[PDB]
Amino acid sequence: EVRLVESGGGLVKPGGSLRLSCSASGFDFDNAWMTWVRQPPGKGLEWVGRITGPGEGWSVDYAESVKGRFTISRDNTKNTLYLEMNNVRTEDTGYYFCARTGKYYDFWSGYAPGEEYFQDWGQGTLVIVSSASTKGPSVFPLAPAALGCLVKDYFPEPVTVSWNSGALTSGVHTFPAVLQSSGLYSLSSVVTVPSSSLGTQTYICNVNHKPSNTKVDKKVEPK
Amino acid sequence: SELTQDPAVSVALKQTVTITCRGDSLRSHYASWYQKKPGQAPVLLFYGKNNRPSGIPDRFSGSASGNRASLTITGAQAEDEADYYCSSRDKSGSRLSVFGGGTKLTVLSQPKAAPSVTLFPPSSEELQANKATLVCLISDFYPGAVTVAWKADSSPVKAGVETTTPSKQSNNKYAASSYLSLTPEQWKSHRSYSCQVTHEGSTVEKTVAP
C-alpha cells in the first residue's frame, strides 16, 4: 500500500542547482519522518539527511559531507519530500532515494537518540554531475592472448562496440562504462584470441557513437 | 567508516552464513539490516533487538553483542544473493545515521575460479596525443568480488584510478576492468607500473614498464 516516487534527476553541471521530489502515499505522511539516501555508482549507500515532523519542530539533520550545500524540506499538504541540491560537485553523482523512516527504542536496553530504521524505500532517481559537452570517443588499440580497444572520453552514453563487423563473437566482452572525474565516460572491450594464429587473421573493432554521429574503426596489431 | 563490514562473503546453497557489522556506536545502539539487489529498491530485513518485519522469511535473524551486529541467514537460497548493509548511529547518542561498508553475498552456483589478469601499457598513439592510460583487464573469476590496487614502482597509486564493477561473461564467470590515467611524463619516468588484483585472500600481480 505504501508507495514512494522520486523524480527530478538528470544531468547537472558542477556548482549548479537541482531539486528532487518524492511523493508519498499509503501512510500518515504528516507525522512520519523522511530521509534521503544516495548510492554512488558501484559504491555503498550513504545517509544524506533526515527531516522530522511537526512534533519535533520540523528539525533537519544533515551528513557532514552534505551540510551547507543541500537543503531538505517537506510539504505535508502535497505529501512530497524535497532535496534542493546546490553547489553540486562531481562526487554527488548517484541514485537518490527517499525512505519512510521508523523510530525504535528498546526500553530495557536503550540509548538517548533512539535507533532509527528506514522501513519503506523508493526506487530512486539518477543525478549525473558532469560539466562536459557532447564529445565523440577516442579509440586506442590494445596490442596482444587478449585484444582490446580503449574507448575514452565519450559523452553522453552510449557507445556500441562491434568486432570485425559482427563476424567476431567468440569470447568478446564489452565492459561497463565508467564516469571519470573529468566528466567523460570511458570504456573498453576485450576479445580472447586463439593465442596461436595472429598474422593470418585481422582484428578490427568498430566503435559507434550515435549522439556525436561518429563511427571509428581501428586495426589492432601486435607490437 | 564508523560501521565496518566484510566486503564479500560466499555461502553454499542451503547453508548458514553470518554477516558481521562492527563499530563503536554498536555498543550503545542496535542496528538495522537491508537487502539491496542491483536496481531494485533496498528492503528492510531486521531492526531493533528481535524485530523482523512481516513478509521477510523467518530464515533471517539478527543479533548483537559488544561492538558487533550480526545478521544470520539460515539455509540460504538463490534469491538471497545481494548486497547487505547495516545502519545505526555514527556515534553514541548522535542524531545522525550512517551505513556500513556493505557485504556482497554470493550463493555458490558455479565452481570457484581464480582470475586471469592482463595489463596493457599506454599505446604510442596515445602518448603522441599527450595522454597515457593503463588498462588492467580481469576475467574468468568466481565469485565476482575482487579488489584492485595500483602500484607506481613500489608505491601505491590513488589518483586517477577507475575500476568497474564485475559483470558476468558468456561463460558464467565474472569480469572486471580497471583504468589508471597518467601523464606521458609520469609514464616514461616510472621504472615499473603494477596492477595488484586480490581475489579471495590471494593476490595476482602484473607489471609493465616503458
Residue numbers in the entry:
A (entry chain H): 1 to 52, 52A, 52B, 52C, 53 to 82, 82A, 82B, 82C, ...
B (entry chain L): 2 to 9, 11 to 95, 95A, 95B, 95C, 96 to 209
Verbatim from the authors:
Antibody 10E8 is one of the broadest monoclonal antibodies thus far identified that effectively neutralizes diverse strains of HIV-1. It targets the membrane-proximal external region (MPER) of the HIV-1 viral spike with a highly hydrophobic antigen-binding region. Here we show cis-trans conformational isomerization of the Tyr-Pro-Pro (YPP) motif in the heavy chain 3rd complementarity-determining region (CDR H3) of antibody 10E8 to be the mechanistic basis of its multipeak behavior. Overall, our results show how a conformationally dynamic cis-proline and the interaction between the CDR H3 and the CDR L1 of 10E8 appear to provide exactly the requisite degree of structural plasticity needed for a highly hydrophobic surface to recognize an MPER epitope.
We tested the influence of the di-proline motif in the CDR H3 of 10E8v4 on its SEC and HIC profiles by mutating prolines at positions 100f or 100g to alanine. Compared to the SEC of 10E8v4, mutating either of these prolines resulted in the three-peak profile of 10E8 merging into a predominantly single peak, suggesting that the prolines cause the SEC anomaly. To define the structural basis for the anomalous SEC and HIC behavior, we determined the crystal structures of 10E8v4 with Pro100f to Ala (10E8v4-100fA) in two different space groups, Pro100g to Ala (10E8v4-100gA) and Pro100f and Pro100g to Ala (10E8v4-100fgAA) variant at 3.7 Å, 2.4 Å, 2 Å and 2.7 Å resolutions, respectively. After rigid body refinement, the CDR H3s (95TGKYYDFWFGYPPGEE YFQD102) of the variants were defined clearly in their Fo-Fc maps contoured at 3σ. Extensive hydrogen bonding networks were observed between the CDR H3 and the CDR L1 of 10E8v4, involving heavy chain residues, Tyr98, Ser100c, Pro100g, Gly100h and Glu100i, and light chain residues Ser30, Tyr32, Lys51 and Arg91. However, these hydrogen bonds were not retained in the Pro to Ala variants, suggesting the YPP motif to be critical for coordinating these hydrogen bonds, and disruption of these hydrogen-bonding interactions correlated with the degree that the CDR H3 conformations differed from that of wild type, their reduced binding affinities, and their reduced neutralization potencies. Crystal structures of P100fA, P100gA, P100fgAA and H31LCF variants all showed “open” CDR H3 conformations, which correlated with reduced affinity to gp41, reduced neutralizing potency against select viruses, and reduced affinity to the column matrix. Part of the data presented here favors the Masiero et al. proposal, as we found the P100gA mutation to reduce affinity to gp41 and neutralization potency substantially and the P100fA variant to retain reasonable neutralization potency against viruses tested.
